[PDB]
């Protein structure tokens, strides 16, 4: 409860980092399969 930590309190809070991660978890498997199925 109270008196949390230091390494829990050192993180910047409302940074993105998990929109970038959520895009990177939905862009990378969806573009790894695009390059293995590609003919012009």
């Amino acid at each position: 409860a109270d008196a949390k930590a230091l390494d829990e309190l050192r993180k910047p809070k409302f940074s993105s980092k998990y929109l970038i991660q959520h895009v990177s978890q939905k862009l990378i498997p969806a573009v790894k399969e695009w390059e293995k199925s590609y003919q012009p």
Partner: protein
């Protein structure tokens, strides 16, 4: 958990919520777990795209831990701020900014054969009053050639352009002869360090003046945001900022099960812990376990 390509980007990184992901992974390898094989796959397009989206998970918390030097006097808080962004980009895997934008020029214009095409495929990365100032020099040199200047160097018409393209660069304020003699090297290291110590006084005057120009825009944005806000009545401000706090909690509370939104509401509950911990002992601050 991590997919091991995150945890390799977070090894030399220094921020908090990544190093507690590394310390939790380094404790798991110590407890008899085997390390995943690093995939030697996903050829050049997917490999350089994962670097784009893994370095931005190192840059994005790192930018938020760098205090801006707003309203400060001196050049040392700007040389602190810029050096914190140098050391942040190095933790995210970037090289020197001189090395990284020169890589961006040769990547955009590997197949530019004319100097008017290299001035229009590297248009986004050059200052526009410098890119235009190289178009009066390209149009002046085009008069004595009356043929398109090629991106050769051995062509005499390129040396007629580079006789006057260098004439702008010194007039812009940047010593082009100390830049060009740095990246060419020298024979003896004694006179290679006379050009190294004159490149790095340009470069330190280069990275400061655009870290300072990035600060003076935030100083002028915050002063125009505040002076737009001091003109309001206090009741308008209290309900304008209560709707924006409500609509942005609501955007993170509709998205349920998503990783970013459940981490968003753990930050709201940790902001409220900071206000509740200061409210218990306000001359000491928040309570840390120590």
């Amino acid at each position: 958990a991590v997919s091991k390509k995150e945890v390799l980007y977070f090894l030399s990184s220094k921020d908090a919520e990544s190093s507690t992901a590394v310390k939790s992974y380094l404790k798991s390898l110590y407890a008899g777990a085997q390390v995943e094989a690093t995939e030697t796959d996903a050829s050049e397009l997917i490999a350089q795209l994962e670097k784009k989206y893994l370095s931005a998970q190192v840059v994005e918390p790192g930018v938020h831990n760098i205090a801006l030097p707003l309203g400060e006097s001196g050049s040392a808080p700007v040389k602190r701020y810029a050096a914190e962004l140098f050391n942040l980009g190095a933790q995210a895997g970037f090289e020197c900014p001189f090395i990284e934008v020169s890589k961006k020029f040769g990547q955009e214009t590997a197949t530019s054969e004319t100097v008017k095409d290299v001035l229009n495929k590297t248009k986004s990365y050059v200052s526009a009053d410098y890119n235009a100032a190289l178009n009066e020099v390209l149009s002046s040199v085009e008069a004595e050639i009356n043929g398109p200047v090629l991106f050769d160097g051995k062509t005499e018409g390129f040396k007629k352009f580079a006789a006057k393209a260098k004439a702008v660069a010194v007039s812009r304020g940047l010593p082009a002869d100390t830049i060009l003699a740095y990246c060419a090297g020298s024979a003896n290291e004694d006179a290679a360090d006379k050009v190294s110590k004159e490149f790095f006084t340009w470069f330190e005057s280069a990275y400061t003046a655009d870290a300072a120009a990035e600060v003076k825009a935030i100083e002028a944005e915050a002063a125009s945001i505040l002076d737009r806000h001091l003109a309001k009545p206090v009741a308008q401000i209290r309900k304008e900022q209560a709707s924006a706090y409500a609509s942005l909690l609501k955007r993170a509370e509709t998205a349920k099960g998503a990783k970013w939104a459940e981490k968003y509401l753990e930050d709201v509950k940790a902001v409220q812990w900071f206000d509740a911990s200061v409210a218990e002992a306000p001359a000491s601050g928040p309570k840390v376990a120590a």
